[PDB]
Amino acid sequence: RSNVFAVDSQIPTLYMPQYISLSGVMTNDNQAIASFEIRDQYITALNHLVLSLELPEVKGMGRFGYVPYVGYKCINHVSISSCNGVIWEIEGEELYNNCINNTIALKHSGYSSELNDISIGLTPNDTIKEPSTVYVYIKTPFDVEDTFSSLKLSDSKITVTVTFNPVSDIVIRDSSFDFETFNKEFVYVPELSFIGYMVKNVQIKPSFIEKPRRVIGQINQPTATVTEVHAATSLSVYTKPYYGNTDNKFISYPGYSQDEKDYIDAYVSRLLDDLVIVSDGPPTGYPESAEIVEVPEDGIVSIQDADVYVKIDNVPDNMSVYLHTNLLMFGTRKNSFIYNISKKFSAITGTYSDATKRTIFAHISHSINIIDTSIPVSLWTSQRNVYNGDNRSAESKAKDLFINDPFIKGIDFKNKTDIISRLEVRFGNDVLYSENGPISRIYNELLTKSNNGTRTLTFNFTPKIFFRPTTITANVSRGKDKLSVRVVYSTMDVNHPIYYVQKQLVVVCNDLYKVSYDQGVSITKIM
Amino acid sequence: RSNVFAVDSQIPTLYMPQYISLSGVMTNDNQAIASFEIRDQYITALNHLVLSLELPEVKGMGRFGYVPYVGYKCINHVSISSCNGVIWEIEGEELYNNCINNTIALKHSGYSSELNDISIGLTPNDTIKEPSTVYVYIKTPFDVEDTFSSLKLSDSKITVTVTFNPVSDIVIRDSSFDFETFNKEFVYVPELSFIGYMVKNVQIKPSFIEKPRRVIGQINQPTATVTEVHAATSLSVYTKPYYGNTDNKFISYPGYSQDEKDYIDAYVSRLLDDLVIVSDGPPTGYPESAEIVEVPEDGIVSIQDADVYVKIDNVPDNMSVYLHTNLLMFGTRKNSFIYNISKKFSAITGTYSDATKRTIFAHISHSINIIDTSIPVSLWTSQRNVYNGDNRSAESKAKDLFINDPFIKGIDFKNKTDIISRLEVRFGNDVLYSENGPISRIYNELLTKSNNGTRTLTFNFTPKIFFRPTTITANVSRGKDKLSVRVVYSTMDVNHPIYYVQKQLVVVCNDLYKVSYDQGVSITKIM
Amino acid sequence: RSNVFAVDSQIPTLYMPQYISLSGVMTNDNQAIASFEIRDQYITALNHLVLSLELPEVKGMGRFGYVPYVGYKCINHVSISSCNGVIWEIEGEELYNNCINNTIALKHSGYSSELNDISIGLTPNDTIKEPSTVYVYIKTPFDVEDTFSSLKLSDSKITVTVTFNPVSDIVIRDSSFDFETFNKEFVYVPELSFIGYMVKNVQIKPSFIEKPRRVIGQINQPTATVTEVHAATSLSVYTKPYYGNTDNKFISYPGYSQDEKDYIDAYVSRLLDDLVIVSDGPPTGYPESAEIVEVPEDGIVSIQDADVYVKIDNVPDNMSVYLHTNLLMFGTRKNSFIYNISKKFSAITGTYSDATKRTIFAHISHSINIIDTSIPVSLWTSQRNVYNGDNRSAESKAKDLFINDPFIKGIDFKNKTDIISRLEVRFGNDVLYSENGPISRIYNELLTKSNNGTRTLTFNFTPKIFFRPTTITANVSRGKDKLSVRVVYSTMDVNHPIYYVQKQLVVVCNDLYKVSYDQGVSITKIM
Amino acid sequence: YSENGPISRIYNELLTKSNNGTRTLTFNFTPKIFFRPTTITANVSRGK
C-alpha cells in the first residue's frame, strides 16, 4: 500500500530571492521608447515583471476623463532581447487579451471613480484631476510554474524595450478642453521591477517556449492567411471596427459604470432633455426641418403607427407641452422605411420643477439598445442620408465627446452582437474545421474559465511545463504549411446606420520555439 | 540535492484532437428522446460533451417569460451505453447540483434580461420573444483529469440518450396566454458536440468510476432506506416541496433579479397598489368582508395593537385617503391568533400623481419575509380557513402567475430556512452519525468551496485519479449492508399557512464501479 | 514514450474518517477561557477545526447592532498543547489576516442584514434581535495538504484553549442603550468540532511546521526589533490607530453596506438634515457662535471664495430658506487656514414636504472623503481648537454612536490611504531591503491573489509540504541574528484634525520549527 | 467537397455538352462498357 499519511521531505536547491528595481532611458510623431539593462552575474533567473507609471496633474476648463484600464491601454509593444537576438515579444492587445481574466491586475491597472468620472472645470486655474500612479503587470510565459519555469540568464545581458501609444488614445474629452497644450506638455515617466533569484551551483537543462504572432487582414476583406506554419498550438479569430473615416465623436459615455443598462440609461438620459420640451409657445432655436407638435388632452400622439403616451404633472397654466417627433432620422429612399429614434419610446412621465425650470422624468419605457448607443454621430449626417439627420439644439451639440479607445472589438462597445455567421479553416489545401454556431467560442470559454473568450481552436491539452506540448505539424511534401481563414459576415438591414461601419479581420497563431542555454540564451524555430 | 531549477522534458504519446458534431434522431404524453451514434475506429477517447438547443419565436398576447437556467432545467435524464449495457447515467437534478458552482456554465445555459424579463404583448401579431440558442455543458466523470481520465472506445459502438421534460415546466405565464396553442406547436431541436482524440499505438489499462444513485421517499414520511450498499463514497440528504394539490399560482415573481431583497421588493410593490387607496367616497368593487376605514388627521390608524403611519402629499381637496385593514387574513379558530398581512406595515409615505391618477410611494418600512413571498395563492383560500382569505380586486386577481419550476428545494425559493432540526444515520443496525446543527453542511461547503451545499457525509479524501478511492465497506455476515436515514422536522406555528406545505425526503448515494477494457468497455460492481 | 492515457492505481492506507464534537469547560475583568480535552487511542490524526457560538436574544430600548464578522472579531487567542508543551498558537488578528481571502468562511462567520442593521427599540419589552448561531473556521497549518499534513497524535493528550475578547468590543450602540445590564447578563456558549481519522498500522515520519510571532512597537515610535531570528520565512509590517485618549464616539456608520460610496452617502445624509434648514424666522436652539444667513433670490451664497448653490421647490409663502455656514470648524491660528465642512458643498437641490415637515433632498455635489467620515467626534472639540467645534443641535448630538472595532488598520476604516512613505529593513547590521513605493505590497497581492495584502518580504518559493522550506539563516559569528525596521511617516497638513491620531507599528515574523513523533509530539527550534 | 460559386454546374455542363445541367459530382471518368466503372467506396469500420 502507498502511504497517504506521510511524505519524505526533500531538500531543495539553496537560493535566495530579492526584489530589484531599475530606472530606464527615454528616447523619442516622436514615439517614446524605454530601454532597461539587467547586468549582474548572480542573477540566475527572474520573472514577474511589473511596470509603474506616474500620471500628472491636469488643470484648466472643460470636461475630461481617462479611459478604463489606462495602464494596459497605454502600452503598444514589449520586447525582450539578448546578444543572440530577440527571445520574446508581444503586442499590447495580445497582453490585454491574455490578462483580461485577472480582476486584481485589472483593478491595479487603474479602475476607479476618481480617475474615470467625467469631471468639470470652471476656471482656468481649477484642478480637474490630482496626480496618481498605476501599475501594469506584464504576464509572461516564465510565470506559469514559478521557479521551474523561470528564465535563466547564463551570464548574458538582457534588454527590455517598451513602446508607448500616443497620449491622445487614452483620454476622453470634449471640444472645449485645450488638448493641444495638454498634449504638448504631457510626458511619460516609467519604472520596471522584477523578482531575481540568486542560485548556488545551478544545473541547467533545455526547455520550451511559445511565441504569439498576429496578422491583420485588409479592409472589408473576408480572408487572411498565415504563412510558414510548422508547429502551432492554437489559432484565434476576431474583428475590429475602423473609425478612421469619421471625426470620432459620440453622443454619450457612462464612465465608471460599465453595464449595458448603464450605457442605455446614460444615452436615454441625454436624449430626454431634448425630446420633450415644456415651453410658452412654439420653441425657437431649432432647424427648419423640425416637426414639433402639441400634445392633446388625452396625452396620446400618433407618429404613423407608433403611439407615445405623455403625462406631465404640475404644468403651469400659461405653458403647454410639446413633443419633438423627428429628433434623429435616417433613410435611403424618399418613401421607404425610416429609422426614427422618436418612435422607440412608448411612455414618458415626470414632473416639472419651477425652481430649476426643467422637467424631472420618472418612469420611462423604451426599446433602445447598445447598437443605437454605439452609432457614431458623424454617420447620422453622411452624404448618403437624404434627410437632415441632426435636429438637436446647439447646446446639446456642444456636449459631444471624443472617444479613441484602441482595443474595441466587434461593432459595439461590449462585443455583444455576433456578426460572424460561418467560419471555415483550411490547413494546406484541405478543410480542417467548419462551423455555423459559436460552439468553438463556448468551448474556449468553458476550458479557460473566462467571460470574454473568442473563437479559438486549441490543439494542446497536455500539462504545460512537465510535458512537451502537442502541436499540429507541417507536411511540406504535400504542401500543408499554411492556414487560410474565410468568414461570411451577417446580413444587416440596408436602412440601419450601423451597416456602413467598416471592419478588419484579425488572426492570431501561436508558434513553438526551442530554448537552449549553452553560450547564454538562444532560440531556434522547431521545424 | 534535488534540482528545482530544471526538469527533463518527457516525450508524450503522439495524438491529435478534433472537434466533432453530430445530429440526432427524435422519437416520441409523447416524451421526447434523442439518440446519438458514435462510430469511428480512430476515435480512441472523448470527453467534454456539450448539448445545444434552439428556442423558437413566441408571438401573441399576454405576459410570458422563461425560468432562469432553462437549458439545465429542460433536461430529465442522460444515459451512455454500449453493446455490453449502460456505462453511466444520471438524472437532471444531480447534474444541476454538480454544476451549480460553475458560473460560466450557468451563464451560457441561458441567463439574461432578454430571456427572463416578463414581457407584455398587446396584439395577436406582436412579437414577444426573438429566437435564440442555449448550450448545456454535461459534466461527466471523464473530465476531471483531461487525457488521463478520458473514456477509451475499444472498437465499440457508443449511444447517448437524452430525455426531455415537458415544455410546461420551463415557462412562466399568466392565464391570458394561449398556452394550449403554444404547447401544441412547440418542438425541441437538439445537437451534440464532443472532443475526440486520435491516438497512435495506445496502451490501455483498467480504471475506476463512481455512479450516483437517487432514492425518493414517501410523502411526509421522515425515513428512507438504500439497499445493496457494498462500497459507497458519500451520502447526501435534502427535501423537496410538493405542490401537486394546488393550482400552482403565485402573487409575484421578480424575474432576472434574484436577490432576497428583490423578491421582497417585488412582493411589496405588488401589494401596495391595493393596500392604500385614494378615492372620492368609499371605494367600490370589493367583497363584502372588506373593512376599509378612513385615515384620521394625525395619520395613525390602530389595528389592535398594531399602528400604521400614513402620510400622502398633494391630495386633492375633494378626495380622502382610505386604508384596507384586512387584505389577506388566515385563522383556524374564531377568536384565536390571526395572521394578517396588513399588520406587517409600520410606515407608508408617498405622493399622489394627478396626471396618471395613482400614488407614487417613496419610503416603506415593513417586516415581510421570503416565506410570505413564497406562500401559494390557493392556500389562502383553502377549506380549513374560516375567513374569506382573498379580499383583493378583480384587476389584481387577474395578474397572478403560474410557476412550475421543477428543481425547488426547501419550502422557499432560496432554500434559506433550515427545516431539519436533527439527523440520524444508521449503517446496518448501528448508529454511524448523529448531529443537531448543520455542521455537516458547513463542512461540505468548506471542502467543496460552494455556496449551495447540502448535508453530506464524505468518506473519500484521496486524490481522484491517481489513487483507488477510499470507501465504506459492507459486512454481509453481520448484516451491515443498508443505510437508513431518519429526520425530525422543525415545529411551526399551527396558524401559519406554510405549515401545510407537503414535503418529500431525497437521499443520494454514490456507488463504486470497476472499468475494464478487454472486449470493449464493461463495468462490474465492486463487492 | 510516457503513457498519458492511463495510470496504475495504487492502493492507499486503510482508514476511516469520523466527525467528532466536544463540549468544553468555562472558567473566568474575568476573561473567559475554554479548554477541550481530546483522548482516544484510535484518533491518529485530525484537522479542520470549527468553533460554534450561540448569540442570545437582546431586548430593550435604543439602537443596537453587531460589527461585521463578529465571530472572528470575538476571538483573542488560540493555543494547542500536549504534555511536552505548546505545539502551535496564534493571536486572533493573525488568524483574521490569514483568512481574510476566504469569502465563504467570512459569510459563515456572521455577515447579514438581520445581524448588522442598526435596529430600533421603542418600549422596554420590544425584541430588537432574535437569537442566532455563528461558526468560526480556525485555519491551521495542518490543513494545507489534507491527509499528508495532518497532525499525528502519538498516544498523547491534546488540549485546545480559546480566550475570548470582552463583549464591549463586538457591539455598536448609542448612549440610550442599557449597556451595563446587557454586559452583566451576557455569557459565551462555545463548542468545538473536528475531523478525526482512524488509521490501521500507520507509519509515521518527522515533518516541518511554521509558527508566527508578533511584536508591537511603542506609541509613535518609528522603529521595532525582532530578536533571536535564526530561520524566518517572511516578515510583515503594518500600522494600527490608537483611540484610547478619546470617548470612541463617531457621527455615522453604514452598517451592512461596506463600500466607500456607502460610507460617504451615510455621512452626507446625516449632515444634510442640519446643514440646510427651512424655518419661519431665525432658527432657535443653536449655540451663540452659529452664523446662519438667509439665502438670496439668485440662490448663491458666498463663504469666502466658496460658492454654494441652493434651490428648494414648493417652499410655503410664510417661510424662508436658511443656510448654516459653519457647522464644523477647526483651526490652530486666529487668522490662518480654517477647515470648514460647509465649504465642501457646491450644489444642493430638493423639495420640501408639507406632510412630514422636512426637506427631501435629491441631487448633491460634494467633495467629502473617507478621512472626513473617519474623524472621531472628540477631536473636533479638543483643547487645541481655538473655535467652538460642534455647532450641531442637541437632537443631532444625541444620535452619536460608540464604535470599538479592535481590528482596524491604517487611519481610516478601509485602510485606503497609504501613510508609509519609506521602508528600510536591516538584518544584523547591513541593509537587506529598502523601497519608496509599495512594490512589495503589490508583489504580495499578486503572489497570494488577495485584495487586502500588506508590505511583506517572502523568502520561501518552494512547494509547501513536499520540500523543506527555504529560509534566511543567521550568522551568529558576525552577529546577523536580529531584524530592525525603520519607517518614515507621511507629512500631513497641521490644520487637518487627522494629524493628531496616534499610531503603533506592528511587525510579524514567521519562525521555523521541527516536528518529531517519538514519545508523542514535540517541537525543537531549528538553529 | 465545398464550394461557393456554381463551378460544379459549369463542369457538369462542359463535360456532358448540355445546356441544362445541375450541380453534380462525377466520380467515373473511364469508358463505359469496356472498363469496370470507378467508384467511391465505403469504409464501414470508420463509418464512412
mmCIF file of C-alpha atoms in Angstrom, chain C residues 4-208:
data_model
loop_
_atom_site.group_PDB
_atom_site.id
_atom_site.type_symbol
_atom_site.label_atom_id
_atom_site.label_comp_id
_atom_site.label_asym_id
_atom_site.label_seq_id
_atom_site.Cartn_x
_atom_site.Cartn_y
_atom_site.Cartn_z
ATOM 1 C CA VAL C 4 -0.586 9.933 -20.820
ATOM 2 C CA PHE C 5 -3.768 7.883 -21.342
ATOM 3 C CA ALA C 6 -3.535 5.507 -18.363
ATOM 4 C CA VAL C 7 -2.197 5.217 -14.817
ATOM 5 C CA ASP C 8 -1.540 2.429 -12.343
ATOM 6 C CA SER C 9 -3.991 2.835 -9.465
ATOM 7 C CA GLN C 10 -2.166 2.496 -6.153
ATOM 8 C CA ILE C 11 -3.880 1.062 -3.078
ATOM 9 C CA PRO C 12 -3.810 3.571 -0.185
ATOM 10 C CA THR C 13 -3.593 3.004 3.553
ATOM 11 C CA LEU C 14 -6.798 1.632 5.074
ATOM 12 C CA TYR C 15 -8.559 4.309 7.131
ATOM 13 C CA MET C 16 -11.984 5.645 8.100
ATOM 14 C CA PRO C 17 -12.892 9.264 8.971
ATOM 15 C CA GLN C 18 -15.411 10.439 11.548
ATOM 16 C CA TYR C 19 -16.882 13.786 12.609
ATOM 17 C CA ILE C 20 -16.413 14.389 16.346
ATOM 18 C CA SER C 21 -17.966 17.080 18.562
ATOM 19 C CA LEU C 22 -16.879 18.145 22.050
ATOM 20 C CA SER C 23 -18.208 20.373 24.824
ATOM 21 C CA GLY C 24 -15.840 22.460 26.925
ATOM 22 C CA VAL C 25 -15.195 23.797 30.420
ATOM 23 C CA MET C 26 -15.627 27.535 31.030
ATOM 24 C CA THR C 27 -13.592 29.487 33.588
ATOM 25 C CA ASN C 28 -13.196 33.179 34.442
ATOM 26 C CA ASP C 29 -12.244 41.507 34.276
ATOM 27 C CA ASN C 30 -12.889 37.736 34.465
ATOM 28 C CA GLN C 31 -11.727 36.916 30.954
ATOM 29 C CA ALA C 32 -13.326 33.736 29.608
ATOM 30 C CA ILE C 33 -11.203 30.654 28.864
ATOM 31 C CA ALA C 34 -12.381 27.371 27.314
ATOM 32 C CA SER C 35 -10.480 24.064 27.495
ATOM 33 C CA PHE C 36 -11.191 20.984 25.348
ATOM 34 C CA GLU C 37 -9.677 17.541 26.013
ATOM 35 C CA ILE C 38 -9.155 15.013 23.189
ATOM 36 C CA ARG C 39 -8.448 11.467 24.430
ATOM 37 C CA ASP C 40 -8.952 8.343 22.284
ATOM 38 C CA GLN C 41 -6.145 5.993 21.269
ATOM 39 C CA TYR C 42 -7.651 5.373 17.782
ATOM 40 C CA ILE C 43 -7.701 9.001 16.686
ATOM 41 C CA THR C 44 -4.437 9.037 14.754
ATOM 42 C CA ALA C 45 -4.837 12.452 13.155
ATOM 43 C CA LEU C 46 -7.143 15.440 12.952
ATOM 44 C CA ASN C 47 -7.631 18.739 11.156
ATOM 45 C CA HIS C 48 -10.301 21.271 10.114
ATOM 46 C CA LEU C 49 -11.227 22.759 13.482
ATOM 47 C CA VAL C 50 -14.532 24.659 13.674
ATOM 48 C CA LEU C 51 -15.822 26.699 16.638
ATOM 49 C CA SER C 52 -19.545 27.432 17.091
ATOM 50 C CA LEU C 53 -21.030 30.279 19.155
ATOM 51 C CA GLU C 54 -24.624 30.961 20.270
ATOM 52 C CA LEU C 55 -25.645 34.656 20.460
ATOM 53 C CA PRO C 56 -28.580 35.425 22.798
ATOM 54 C CA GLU C 57 -31.779 37.441 22.472
ATOM 55 C CA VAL C 58 -31.459 41.202 23.058
ATOM 56 C CA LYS C 59 -34.433 43.226 24.331
ATOM 57 C CA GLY C 60 -34.984 46.834 25.377
ATOM 58 C CA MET C 61 -34.964 50.389 24.043
ATOM 59 C CA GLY C 62 -32.443 52.204 21.874
ATOM 60 C CA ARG C 63 -30.381 51.467 18.781
ATOM 61 C CA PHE C 64 -28.174 48.392 18.604
ATOM 62 C CA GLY C 65 -26.201 46.339 16.100
ATOM 63 C CA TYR C 66 -23.298 43.928 15.764
ATOM 64 C CA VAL C 67 -19.991 44.566 13.995
ATOM 65 C CA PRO C 68 -19.333 42.653 10.748
ATOM 66 C CA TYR C 69 -17.593 39.279 11.156
ATOM 67 C CA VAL C 70 -18.450 39.151 14.851
ATOM 68 C CA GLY C 71 -17.403 35.509 15.133
ATOM 69 C CA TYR C 72 -13.851 36.258 14.035
ATOM 70 C CA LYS C 73 -13.609 39.516 15.957
ATOM 71 C CA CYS C 74 -14.663 37.853 19.232
ATOM 72 C CA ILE C 75 -11.571 35.576 19.378
ATOM 73 C CA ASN C 76 -8.468 36.761 21.249
ATOM 74 C CA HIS C 77 -6.133 33.741 21.337
ATOM 75 C CA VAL C 78 -5.970 30.045 20.407
ATOM 76 C CA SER C 79 -3.476 27.524 21.793
ATOM 77 C CA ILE C 80 -2.810 23.823 21.163
ATOM 78 C CA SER C 81 -0.758 21.914 23.722
ATOM 79 C CA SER C 82 0.323 18.443 24.791
ATOM 80 C CA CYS C 83 2.248 17.052 27.749
ATOM 81 C CA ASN C 84 5.537 18.228 26.185
ATOM 82 C CA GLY C 85 4.270 21.819 25.945
ATOM 83 C CA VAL C 86 2.807 24.127 23.327
ATOM 84 C CA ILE C 87 2.681 22.858 19.746
ATOM 85 C CA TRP C 88 1.072 25.832 17.992
ATOM 86 C CA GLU C 89 -0.571 29.121 18.936
ATOM 87 C CA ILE C 90 -1.714 32.327 17.263
ATOM 88 C CA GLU C 91 -3.464 35.575 18.110
ATOM 89 C CA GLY C 92 -6.877 36.417 16.702
ATOM 90 C CA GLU C 93 -5.641 39.192 14.420
ATOM 91 C CA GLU C 94 -3.184 36.898 12.640
ATOM 92 C CA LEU C 95 -5.967 34.361 12.078
ATOM 93 C CA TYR C 96 -8.230 37.073 10.660
ATOM 94 C CA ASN C 97 -5.470 38.269 8.328
ATOM 95 C CA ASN C 98 -4.792 34.713 7.149
ATOM 96 C CA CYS C 99 -8.498 34.027 6.500
ATOM 97 C CA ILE C 100 -9.394 37.438 5.012
ATOM 98 C CA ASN C 101 -9.429 35.989 1.466
ATOM 99 C CA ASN C 102 -11.944 33.181 2.196
ATOM 100 C CA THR C 103 -15.346 34.617 1.273
ATOM 101 C CA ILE C 104 -17.281 31.514 2.326
ATOM 102 C CA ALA C 105 -15.701 31.437 5.787
ATOM 103 C CA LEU C 106 -16.343 35.170 6.167
ATOM 104 C CA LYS C 107 -20.005 34.745 5.225
ATOM 105 C CA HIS C 108 -20.442 31.853 7.654
ATOM 106 C CA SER C 109 -18.825 33.867 10.449
ATOM 107 C CA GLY C 110 -21.787 36.261 10.563
ATOM 108 C CA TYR C 111 -22.471 38.757 7.775
ATOM 109 C CA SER C 112 -26.105 39.627 7.085
ATOM 110 C CA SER C 113 -28.678 42.402 7.262
ATOM 111 C CA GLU C 114 -30.515 40.793 10.186
ATOM 112 C CA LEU C 115 -27.357 40.921 12.314
ATOM 113 C CA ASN C 116 -25.690 44.108 11.071
ATOM 114 C CA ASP C 117 -28.603 46.503 10.516
ATOM 115 C CA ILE C 118 -28.977 49.194 13.184
ATOM 116 C CA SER C 119 -32.340 48.249 14.692
ATOM 117 C CA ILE C 120 -34.532 50.474 16.867
ATOM 118 C CA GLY C 121 -36.456 49.592 20.029
ATOM 119 C CA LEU C 122 -39.428 51.627 21.238
ATOM 120 C CA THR C 123 -40.582 50.007 24.507
ATOM 121 C CA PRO C 124 -38.728 48.139 27.277
ATOM 122 C CA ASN C 125 -40.346 44.869 26.104
ATOM 123 C CA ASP C 126 -39.539 45.233 22.395
ATOM 124 C CA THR C 127 -37.426 42.482 20.824
ATOM 125 C CA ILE C 128 -34.538 44.079 18.929
ATOM 126 C CA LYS C 129 -32.645 40.952 17.817
ATOM 127 C CA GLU C 130 -33.607 37.290 17.597
ATOM 128 C CA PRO C 131 -31.135 34.581 18.680
ATOM 129 C CA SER C 132 -28.817 33.006 16.117
ATOM 130 C CA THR C 133 -25.606 30.982 15.777
ATOM 131 C CA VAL C 134 -22.271 31.705 14.066
ATOM 132 C CA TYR C 135 -19.373 29.418 13.097
ATOM 133 C CA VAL C 136 -15.663 30.320 13.035
ATOM 134 C CA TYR C 137 -13.298 28.240 10.878
ATOM 135 C CA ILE C 138 -9.913 28.129 12.654
ATOM 136 C CA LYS C 139 -7.483 27.615 9.772
ATOM 137 C CA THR C 140 -4.317 25.799 10.870
ATOM 138 C CA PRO C 141 -1.102 24.675 9.133
ATOM 139 C CA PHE C 142 -2.372 21.074 9.294
ATOM 140 C CA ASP C 143 -4.938 21.710 6.527
ATOM 141 C CA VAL C 144 -2.776 22.679 3.551
ATOM 142 C CA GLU C 145 -2.290 19.126 2.210
ATOM 143 C CA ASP C 146 -5.245 17.096 3.560
ATOM 144 C CA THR C 147 -4.163 13.699 4.879
ATOM 145 C CA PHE C 148 -0.477 14.315 4.137
ATOM 146 C CA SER C 149 -0.251 17.296 6.502
ATOM 147 C CA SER C 150 -2.487 16.092 9.349
ATOM 148 C CA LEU C 151 -1.275 16.141 12.965
ATOM 149 C CA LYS C 152 -0.466 12.684 14.357
ATOM 150 C CA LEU C 153 -1.495 12.094 17.992
ATOM 151 C CA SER C 154 1.095 9.530 19.071
ATOM 152 C CA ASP C 155 -0.939 8.335 22.095
ATOM 153 C CA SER C 156 -0.816 11.714 23.853
ATOM 154 C CA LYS C 157 -3.381 14.100 25.332
ATOM 155 C CA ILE C 158 -4.168 17.237 23.302
ATOM 156 C CA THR C 159 -5.615 20.411 24.852
ATOM 157 C CA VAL C 160 -7.140 23.321 22.904
ATOM 158 C CA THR C 161 -7.548 26.654 24.722
ATOM 159 C CA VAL C 162 -9.585 29.608 23.403
ATOM 160 C CA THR C 163 -9.543 33.055 25.051
ATOM 161 C CA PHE C 164 -12.384 35.491 24.307
ATOM 162 C CA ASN C 165 -12.478 39.271 23.967
ATOM 163 C CA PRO C 166 -14.831 41.246 26.239
ATOM 164 C CA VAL C 167 -18.299 41.703 24.764
ATOM 165 C CA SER C 168 -17.976 45.507 24.651
ATOM 166 C CA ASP C 169 -15.699 45.134 21.604
ATOM 167 C CA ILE C 170 -18.267 43.420 19.346
ATOM 168 C CA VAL C 171 -21.258 45.747 19.863
ATOM 169 C CA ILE C 172 -22.170 49.042 18.180
ATOM 170 C CA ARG C 173 -24.578 51.091 20.267
ATOM 171 C CA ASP C 174 -25.759 54.580 21.131
ATOM 172 C CA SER C 175 -25.828 56.117 24.607
ATOM 173 C CA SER C 176 -29.516 55.288 25.225
ATOM 174 C CA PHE C 177 -28.961 51.504 25.325
ATOM 175 C CA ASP C 178 -28.631 49.895 28.776
ATOM 176 C CA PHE C 179 -25.171 48.513 28.161
ATOM 177 C CA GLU C 180 -24.363 47.909 31.824
ATOM 178 C CA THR C 181 -27.263 45.477 32.198
ATOM 179 C CA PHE C 182 -26.575 43.843 28.829
ATOM 180 C CA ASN C 183 -22.899 43.364 29.740
ATOM 181 C CA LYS C 184 -23.804 41.994 33.165
ATOM 182 C CA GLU C 185 -26.137 39.362 31.693
ATOM 183 C CA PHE C 186 -24.186 38.320 28.553
ATOM 184 C CA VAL C 187 -22.455 34.893 28.547
ATOM 185 C CA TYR C 188 -20.412 32.999 25.915
ATOM 186 C CA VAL C 189 -21.537 29.485 24.867
ATOM 187 C CA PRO C 190 -18.919 27.659 22.695
ATOM 188 C CA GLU C 191 -18.500 24.201 21.079
ATOM 189 C CA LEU C 192 -15.609 22.627 19.109
ATOM 190 C CA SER C 193 -15.789 20.220 16.138
ATOM 191 C CA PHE C 194 -13.080 18.442 14.128
ATOM 192 C CA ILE C 195 -12.482 15.605 11.642
ATOM 193 C CA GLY C 196 -10.709 12.543 13.056
ATOM 194 C CA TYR C 197 -9.018 9.688 11.166
ATOM 195 C CA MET C 198 -8.899 6.088 12.415
ATOM 196 C CA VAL C 199 -5.801 4.549 10.805
ATOM 197 C CA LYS C 200 -4.618 0.926 10.731
ATOM 198 C CA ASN C 201 -0.858 0.274 11.079
ATOM 199 C CA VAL C 202 0.301 3.846 10.490
ATOM 200 C CA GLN C 203 3.940 4.533 9.546
ATOM 201 C CA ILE C 204 4.999 7.907 10.968
ATOM 202 C CA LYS C 205 7.831 10.190 9.806
ATOM 203 C CA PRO C 206 9.037 13.615 11.002
ATOM 204 C CA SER C 207 7.800 16.817 9.374
ATOM 205 C CA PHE C 208 8.056 20.619 9.485
#
